[PDB]
Ligand binder design. Structure first.
Ligand SMILES: [Zn+2]
Lengths: 8, 262
């Protein structure tokens, strides 16, 4: 699943 | 060139509009990120996580109660509306307009947008920690215990509400603790939603990006999928384009957008 803001 | 854009606009049959915090900002909504976005001693990144909630659910809810209530006095701006009327007008012509938004303030709905995809969720929904149920909720206050809590002054006293007295699930047999149905830091997006959005961007023949940039999350996940099909993309934000430089309409969405969609 897609981490939000790409985990960043 | 605006007239160039309108020429596309004219033809478009399936339009998708992606919206970032630029637009919720224009309606005077705090995002709590970067300079002077504090809430008491904290910023979002500190509080909008599952660890914070786990550790100190009163404080996180205090935070989200505030954000819920500040909405009572923030209204949709002209961009919100222009979109909503657009969707409506084009709907009647058998054309389609869908919104994909990272915002959680429900302003699109309050403007009358219908086919909206809230990919970070919404402040006015709750999910149950116990049974997982998602239910609309705009109660003010959301629960008595929180009445007049969540003040943002850095020296406010913690409410330190017993977890039992925070918002609970109403299915009785359940009584689970509720959290906001928002995507926190370190959480994944809902795949059901993303599959839909994908389907929608695969069908669209024009794409707008509003109050954020194609280059940054979350626009970045998708604008590529559409651009690579050769579909035009139009940004409306206040980020700057360098001299030597698909369309980009610098300025507050409130101003730039409604003429564009007329
Ligand atoms: Zn429940």
């Amino acid at each position: 699943g897609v981490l939000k803001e790409y985990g960043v | 060139d605006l007239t160039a854009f309108r020429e596309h606009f004219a033809k478009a049959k399936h339009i998708a509009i992606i919206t970032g915090a630029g637009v919720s900002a224009e309606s005077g909504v705090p995002t709590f990120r970067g300079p002077g976005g504090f809430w008491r001693k904290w910023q979002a990144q500190d509080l909008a996580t599952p660890e914070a909630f786990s550790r100190d659910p009163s404080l996180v809810w205090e935070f989200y109660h505030y954000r819920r209530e500040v909405m009572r006095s923030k209204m949709p701006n002209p961009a919100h509306l222009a979109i909503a009327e657009c969707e409506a007008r084009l709907g009647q012509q058998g054309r389609s307009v869908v919104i994909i938004t990272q915002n959680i303030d429900e302003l699109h709905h309050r403007a009358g947008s219908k086919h909206v995809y809230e990919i970070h969720g919404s402040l006015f929904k709750t999910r149950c920690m116990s049974c997982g149920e998602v239910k609309a909720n705009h109660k003010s206050p959301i629960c008595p215990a929180l009445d007049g809590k969540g003040a943002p002054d850095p020296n406010t006293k913690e409410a330190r509400i017993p977890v039992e007295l925070l918002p609970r699930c109403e299915r009785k047999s359940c009584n689970g603790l509720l959290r906001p149905h928002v995507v926190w830091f370190g959480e994944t997006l809902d795949s059901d939603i993303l599959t839909a959005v994908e389907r929608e961007l695969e069908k669209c023949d024009l794409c707008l990006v509003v109050g954020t940039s194609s280059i940054v999350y979350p626009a970045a996940m998708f604008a590529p999928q559409v651009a690579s099909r050769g579909v035009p993309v139009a940004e409306f934000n206040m980020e700057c384009t360098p001299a030597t430089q698909k369309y980009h309409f610098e300025g507050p969405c409130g101003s730039t957008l409604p003429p564009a969609l007329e």
